[PDB]
Scaffold this active site. Sequence first.
Site, PDB file in Angstrom:
ATOM      1  N   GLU A  80      17.436  73.833  39.655  1.00  0.00           N
ATOM      2  CA  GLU A  80      17.811  72.597  40.329  1.00  0.00           C
ATOM      3  C   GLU A  80      19.310  72.559  40.645  1.00  0.00           C
ATOM      4  O   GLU A  80      19.703  72.200  41.753  1.00  0.00           O
ATOM      5  CB  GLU A  80      17.390  71.393  39.492  1.00  0.00           C
ATOM      6  CG  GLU A  80      18.036  70.087  39.924  1.00  0.00           C
ATOM      7  CD  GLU A  80      17.444  69.490  41.208  1.00  0.00           C
ATOM      8  OE1 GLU A  80      17.044  70.263  42.112  1.00  0.00           O
ATOM      9  OE2 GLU A  80      17.403  68.229  41.309  1.00  0.00           O
ATOM     10  N   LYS A 113       0.581  54.439  42.850  1.00  0.00           N
ATOM     11  CA  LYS A 113       0.980  54.251  44.244  1.00  0.00           C
ATOM     12  C   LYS A 113       0.023  53.260  44.937  1.00  0.00           C
ATOM     13  O   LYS A 113       0.454  52.274  45.551  1.00  0.00           O
ATOM     14  CB  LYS A 113       0.975  55.607  44.981  1.00  0.00           C
ATOM     15  CG  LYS A 113       2.105  56.574  44.549  1.00  0.00           C
ATOM     16  CD  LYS A 113       1.909  57.979  45.123  1.00  0.00           C
ATOM     17  CE  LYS A 113       0.952  58.795  44.267  1.00  0.00           C
ATOM     18  NZ  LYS A 113       0.263  59.888  45.030  1.00  0.00           N
TER      19      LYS A 113
HETATM   20  N1  ADP Z   1       2.180  52.395  36.513  1.00  0.00           N
HETATM   21  C1  ADP Z   1       0.909  52.102  36.140  1.00  0.00           C
HETATM   22  N2  ADP Z   1       0.647  51.058  35.314  1.00  0.00           N
HETATM   23  C2  ADP Z   1      -0.611  50.746  34.931  1.00  0.00           C
HETATM   24  N3  ADP Z   1      -1.688  51.454  35.342  1.00  0.00           N
HETATM   25  C3  ADP Z   1      -1.559  52.522  36.173  1.00  0.00           C
HETATM   26  C4  ADP Z   1      -0.227  52.911  36.628  1.00  0.00           C
HETATM   27  N4  ADP Z   1      -0.377  53.981  37.433  1.00  0.00           N
HETATM   28  C5  ADP Z   1      -1.712  54.264  37.495  1.00  0.00           C
HETATM   29  N5  ADP Z   1      -2.418  53.384  36.730  1.00  0.00           N
HETATM   30  C6  ADP Z   1      -3.894  53.356  36.540  1.00  0.00           C
HETATM   31  O1  ADP Z   1      -4.478  54.632  36.847  1.00  0.00           O
HETATM   32  C7  ADP Z   1      -4.849  54.657  38.229  1.00  0.00           C
HETATM   33  C8  ADP Z   1      -3.839  55.469  39.031  1.00  0.00           C
HETATM   34  O2  ADP Z   1      -4.396  55.705  40.315  1.00  0.00           O
HETATM   35  P1  ADP Z   1      -3.622  55.320  41.671  1.00  0.00           P
HETATM   36  O3  ADP Z   1      -3.187  53.881  41.616  1.00  0.00           O
HETATM   37  O4  ADP Z   1      -4.469  55.797  42.840  1.00  0.00           O
HETATM   38  O5  ADP Z   1      -2.311  56.248  41.556  1.00  0.00           O
HETATM   39  P2  ADP Z   1      -1.861  57.188  42.786  1.00  0.00           P
HETATM   40  O6  ADP Z   1      -2.022  56.349  44.029  1.00  0.00           O
HETATM   41  O7  ADP Z   1      -0.435  57.501  42.396  1.00  0.00           O
HETATM   42  O8  ADP Z   1      -2.804  58.362  42.742  1.00  0.00           O
HETATM   43  C9  ADP Z   1      -4.862  53.209  38.727  1.00  0.00           C
HETATM   44  O9  ADP Z   1      -6.142  52.845  39.279  1.00  0.00           O
HETATM   45  C10 ADP Z   1      -4.471  52.365  37.529  1.00  0.00           C
HETATM   46  O10 ADP Z   1      -5.599  51.717  36.945  1.00  0.00           O
HETATM   47 MG    MG Z   2      -3.614  59.908  44.045  1.00  0.00          MG
END
Ligand code: ADP
Ligand code: MG
Lengths: 421, 411, 406, 421
Positions: A254, A58
């Site tokens: 669901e 996100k």
């Molecule tokens: N769809 C994705 N593709 C590649 N890397 C991802 C993805 N989702 C998460 N990651 C990795 O893991 C971490 C997920 O954390 P974040 O971006 O804060 O997700 P959220 O906001 O959903 O908690 C990121 O920093 C990234 O490096």
């Molecule tokens: Mg988070």
Amino acid sequence: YKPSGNKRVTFKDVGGAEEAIEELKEVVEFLKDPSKFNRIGARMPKGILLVGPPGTGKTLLARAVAGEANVPFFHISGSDFVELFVGVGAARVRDLFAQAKAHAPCIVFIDEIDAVGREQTLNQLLVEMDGFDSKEGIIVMAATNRPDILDPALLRPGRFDKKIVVDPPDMLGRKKILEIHTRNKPLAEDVNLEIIAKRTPGFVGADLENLVNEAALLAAREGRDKITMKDFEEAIDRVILISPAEKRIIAYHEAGHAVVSTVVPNGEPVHRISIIPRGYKALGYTLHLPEEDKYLVSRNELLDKLTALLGGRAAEEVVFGDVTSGAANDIERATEIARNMVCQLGMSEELGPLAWGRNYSEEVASKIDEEVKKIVTNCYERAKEIIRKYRKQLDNIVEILLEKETIEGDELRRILSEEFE
Amino acid sequence: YKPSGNKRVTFKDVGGAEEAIEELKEVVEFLKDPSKFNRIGARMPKGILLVGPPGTGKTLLARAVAGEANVPFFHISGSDFVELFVGVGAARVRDLFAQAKAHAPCIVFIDEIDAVGRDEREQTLNQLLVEMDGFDSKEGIIVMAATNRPDILDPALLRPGRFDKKIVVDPPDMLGRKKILEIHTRNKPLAEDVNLEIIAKRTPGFVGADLENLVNEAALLAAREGRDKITMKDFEEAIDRVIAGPLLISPAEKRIIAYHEAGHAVVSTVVPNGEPVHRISIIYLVSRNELLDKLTALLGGRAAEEVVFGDVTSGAANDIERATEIARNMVCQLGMSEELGPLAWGKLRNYSEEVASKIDEEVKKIVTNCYERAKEIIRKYRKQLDNIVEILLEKETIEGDELRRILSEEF
Amino acid sequence: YKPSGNKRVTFKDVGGAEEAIEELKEVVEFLKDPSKFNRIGARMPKGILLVGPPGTGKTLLARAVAGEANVPFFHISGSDFVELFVGVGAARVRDLFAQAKAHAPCIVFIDEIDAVGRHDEREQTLNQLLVEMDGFDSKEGIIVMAATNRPDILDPALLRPGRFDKKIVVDPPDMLGRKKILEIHTRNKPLAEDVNLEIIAKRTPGFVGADLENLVNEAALLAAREGRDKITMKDFEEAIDRVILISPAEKRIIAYHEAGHAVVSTVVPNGEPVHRISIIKYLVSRNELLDKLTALLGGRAAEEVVFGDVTSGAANDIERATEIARNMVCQLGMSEELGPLAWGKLRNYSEEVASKIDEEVKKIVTNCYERAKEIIRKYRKQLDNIVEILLEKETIEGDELRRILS
Amino acid sequence: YKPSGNKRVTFKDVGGAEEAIEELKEVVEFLKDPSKFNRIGARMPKGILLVGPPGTGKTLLARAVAGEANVPFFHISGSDFVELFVGVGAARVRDLFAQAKAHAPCIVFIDEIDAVGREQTLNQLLVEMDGFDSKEGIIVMAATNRPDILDPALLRPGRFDKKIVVDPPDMLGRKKILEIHTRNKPLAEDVNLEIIAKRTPGFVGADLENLVNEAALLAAREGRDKITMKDFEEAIDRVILISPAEKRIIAYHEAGHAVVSTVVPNGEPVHRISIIPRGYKALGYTLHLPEEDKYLVSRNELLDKLTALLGGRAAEEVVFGDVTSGAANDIERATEIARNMVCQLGMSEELGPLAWGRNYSEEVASKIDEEVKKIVTNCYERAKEIIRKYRKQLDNIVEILLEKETIEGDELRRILSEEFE
Ligand SMILES: Nc1ncnc2c1ncn2[C@@H]1O[C@H](COP(=O)(O)OP(=O)(O)O)[C@@H](O)[C@H]1O
Ligand SMILES: [Mg+2]
Ligand SMILES: Nc1ncnc2c1ncn2[C@@H]1O[C@H](COP(=O)(O)OP(=O)(O)O)[C@@H](O)[C@H]1O
Ligand SMILES: Nc1ncnc2c1ncn2[C@@H]1O[C@H](COP(=O)(O)OP(=O)(O)O)[C@@H](O)[C@H]1O
Ligand SMILES: Nc1ncnc2c1ncn2[C@@H]1O[C@H](COP(=O)(O)OP(=O)(O)O)[C@@H](O)[C@H]1O
Ligand SMILES: [Mg+2]
Ligand SMILES: [Mg+2]
Ligand SMILES: [Mg+2]
Ligand SMILES: [Zn+2]
Ligand SMILES: [Zn+2]
Ligand SMILES: [Zn+2]
Ligand SMILES: [Zn+2]
């Protein structure tokens, strides 16, 4: 406040969210030159809500959008405003927007937006949202894994009136995320990320990035210059799913939400149902979202909504004879609503058009409890009456669900109409 | 702040802590040559939290890692920072890290971290946070902390980037006691009659610190009589000494704990939804029945005590607590009550005494049913209960393809 | 910094500190022949802290260890190091340890160690101390002893292993100890054959060794003042008024209270053996807790039976006993009616249960109280005998008490 | 901490406390050269408690003693320790004494000593008191107008084992205080401080110093170079006593305390009785002081003490048929004691040898209340029984009291023995 000095990311760096990137491509186009939209009156959203479980990228996508448009990115975290002294919260929201406008076009990101959007701090946010001119190239993105907790005032048009759902990744999405986080890493020839994607059900991007790191630690521990398949196999175990009889129950829960919401007159249209562990597209989640279209709700609307919320559990009880913990959140939300009807809305028989709330005697505490119980219990039994009456439909919807996992558009509408025509 | 001038130790000096040492091996290698990790971006933790009762070797392991890596060891006590004048604590933490960076790689070790991380303490702890966040892991600095009071810690300390890796240091069982006795006996003249196994077996409850003292008391007994070898009688008598100087598990108590532990295992095995039982030692979505089974098993220790001994001891307090948590959760959250309905009662209590009273009757009813069921199971499977106890007393720990088979040969 | 040139004392010179002498006898054996310990790795403490009020024989003890071992004694005072110019204190500590090594085996004694072991030059001086303690080889037969009546003022760095990690508590003497002290300080004096040191011990409660030495001296001066060549009982009796509290009725009461705890403890099957009375497990079973509770109520039980009136004396015990009962009921599942349930932890339960908990807690405490009283009445005579000895000597040993419970 | 830089005072500057100055003259002699006492074993107190109402020169005398001995004076205020974070209180008590010893001989003054002497902070105080060597010329003086609130551990021998009572001043004392505070002031010829002393009943030194200032303000307001009699007359009114029928009741209340404490077997010896508005010499105050001689107290001792505390009110009711507010503090102290008997000391019938304290049910709350009421009511009726039985004595003691105002030494003992021989 001073814009992120973190490393710029693009969509290149985001795996397994091709649908989300699709929708966000316009926002990138907008940021790169808002004057192409402005010139012909193409009105963009002012607020975009990202919804999904934690660790699903996100925050990543928000940053990808800013890096992709080569525009400044302000990262704020909602949990930073709660706990603040009197006024400090609103003054920080003020400042945030004053900086945004000075650096426009730009992205303002508010993580954990539920943390502030459940008084002064949120009220200030709402005025800032409506105070700023979209055409100046300002877009505010927010993230939450708890959109059911949000103030519906947040989702009103002219604010966060679009949202995108970021789901956990399937096997193919997991493989891609593995490849991204292994790009600059030295892999042995025997490493097969495919098998690792297959063996990591339930893992999100954050978990996968971690697994990759654990794998690197295993190699480095042994002084090795390449990461082996064994290292990945081993790493999974260090970080540690659903049975086909549990899948069944989830499907019945669901479907139950779906059947009751369809039958009940003031039911919420059902646009998708899903049995993905924690997809936020399921109707079970949807039914917990705050009313964003209306401003008033009637006693019968609430009783219909309450009955729909209890459909999951009603279906489990009717069909399996007992109940699991799955419905805990539904029970909690339904109870909240009933307490609100009795204590705030003047919607009980016995208690009258009075605000109770504690301000009152044990004697009243007790009637409140009786009244709240009555509403929830009556709605629960109504739910089961409906499940039983529409058992064949319930059974049919489950069957498809078990097969398709997620049913979404025109296709869902065919099925429901066939079924309740 | 200076590095310790005491004697460098290694893992050769630590007994009965094999699992902790295996987790720590990574840290040793990192410190020997961070380049090996940094080269491939294998990210190490900044802070490692060692959790365990006093005298179990937390400080020793921290030292062993530094000694094994041949890197300086900074030895700090959390208890020093509390009681300090305004700002003196923060300034110390600041200095402490200044010196760590000037000596990197190195271990900074904060004993009793719960003393700092439970005004001024705020500023002192805030300063800790700043320095943790503020240092570069790539530069070979590891902060280790110890506590036997983890629940009292600020969660800020446990955030990712901070003390986000924890290792549990357990009390030694028989074989570990035996190893610790051998370590602390390496350089001492022992009579031929000395049998460290027997003394291992006779000191259930003793931690590494207790056993090192034991050996010294044994030595002091020989010395007092001018004797040039430590004898079995010296060790035996030293036991009675270490005790009344400053907790041994009595034989009678050993028996009860064996039955308690055997009880959990028997009930867990019989109950359909029981959790597999991997080990016994003396030292998403759940269903109603899964929960009743879990609860019944949790009450098995106490069930065994009551049935076998008639009396019941304080030993089941933690299990009673847990069992009760489960039953309140069933009644107050999951709508799994007979009479209270599919309602959330609570969230802090927002209901009448009339309801509070029903909740109590329903929680008491669930727990009491599971208790009686546990007792039926124990009586029904008394023979196997008795066989497991007999073995468990012989070994103190039963585990692996040995516990695997015992539960088959029995059930 | 040279060996003290003051008179040799041995343990014969120290009265009423038998427990502490017994702890120090191994230090004496070590000083006499370190190689006996050294060769089997018997490690001795580097620092021994003596804790107790002024005039109780802390310094005397340290001197006696040295005299006993026939080894030099360095006497320093912590209060000398306060007030010093910059650096001077550290250098003195350096030199002091240099001298102890030249003269080993020996005792280095630091009086009033709190004066240095406590915000400036003291740091420096104290830090040098820590360095010297850490620096010296115990096997050389060097032992540093320290004294304080103010141990909570002390920097915990001092108390750490390898430093002052042995503490010996030195208490005011009981009546027999006071008698011995009087013998000692009377060895070299002309006493009349009417002098009754026991009666003088009895009439001097609260006196410490320093007080009793002073008293002997005032007795001597009194006789001399009157041109007499023997010190009589009248001289000692008059002396007491010169070197100068608890009601004898209050003393009785306290004695019955303490004796009561002790009789109940002894009689009750799971009680804690009584090691000493003075008028100055991992798991625990239900019966063990009830026995403990009953014992805790014995002091009060003894007051009610014997005096019919009760005092505020049992306040702490009543609190303790009630704590135990509540824990049995609320955390240990040891109540009749309340089940194997955790009630509480703050209060997470109804008034109906609150009230049942109070009934059950009350019922346990009351039952144990009555039981204590029964034991008291059943053992009244021996209770009375114990109190009679306790009042006389102030402190009786368990073996003696169990014996009386013949 | 750093010793007072305030202006040195002597006894020259203290009016209407000739008795207090008398007792303190030895302390001055001690401070000037402790070696005269030390040499012959004259053991001074380590702690001296000053007791009186606020504004009576308690602090003044402490400072007068230090200025008179030309020794340093440390002024601390008890209310500065309460409210402090964990440990800060004890560390300040530590430091205080460490400074005292470095500057010995000296006076350490602790104002509002009740503020600390009602855990860690007081425990540290007690160890410091007993830790220091009197012979080093250290004397600790303390002030309080609430000595009934003090921990009896404070008044144990070797601590604050002497006290001095500083009373409000009569007319002659008031005149002197007026003269002192007018020394360097320009008075008109017509000023008569005598008449001003007579017209200011109830005024303490602090009030009088204020009145003098108000008088100066009146002159300066009008630009005048001398303070007139009119200015003093006028000033009194700006700052603003007992009726002969109120005097009577006060006399009956105090006599009542005296009669009941005499008759009751475990009564506290009666050394003085007084009907001066707020003299702390009265027995009414005395009966509220903490037990400093003993360590144990028996149930019957407490019932006797409780009955004595209620003697004041018993005498009013018996004699006048109704009751005034005078006994509020007696009622409060008596209730405290009874609650303590029931809830802490195990001295109730019904409640048993149990510590109650809240930790317990409404059902127990209620029995506690019944039990506490029973004790107080029974003691109150006993008090009245005694008053009535000894009415003639009560009447006699009142009569003298009305005449003499304060009865103190051998004379009091004559009267009580005549009366109860
Ligand atoms: N769809 C994705 N593709 C590649 N890397 C991802 C993805 N989702 C998460 N990651 C990795 O893991 C971490 C997920 O954390 P974040 O971006 O804060 O997700 P959220 O906001 O959903 O908690 C990121 O920093 C990234 O490096
Ligand atoms: Mg988070
Ligand atoms: N596992 C062990 N093996 C060998 N010796 C031990 C062990 N644990 C403790 N000891 C001995 O006792 C001491 C225990 O102290 P410490 O390491 O400080 O334990 P903790 O830090 O857990 O309180 C050690 O220095 C060592 O001499
Ligand atoms: N237990 C004792 N036995 C005999 N004499 C004692 C005893 N305690 C104190 N004294 C006498 O009083 C003197 C002062 O006591 P000291 O040794 O200085 O006590 P502390 O070191 O505890 O202040 C001693 O030198 C000794 O002569
Ligand atoms: N007996 C007295 N004689 C002269 N002045 C006095 C007297 N008592 C009080 N004062 C004046 O009024 C003030 C009374 O305050 P203080 O000494 O704090 O009394 P207390 O300590 O009783 O409150 C003093 O500062 C002093 O100037
Ligand atoms: Mg430790
Ligand atoms: Mg001394
Ligand atoms: Mg005042
Ligand atoms: Zn649901
Ligand atoms: Zn257990
Ligand atoms: Zn007691
Ligand atoms: Zn009164």
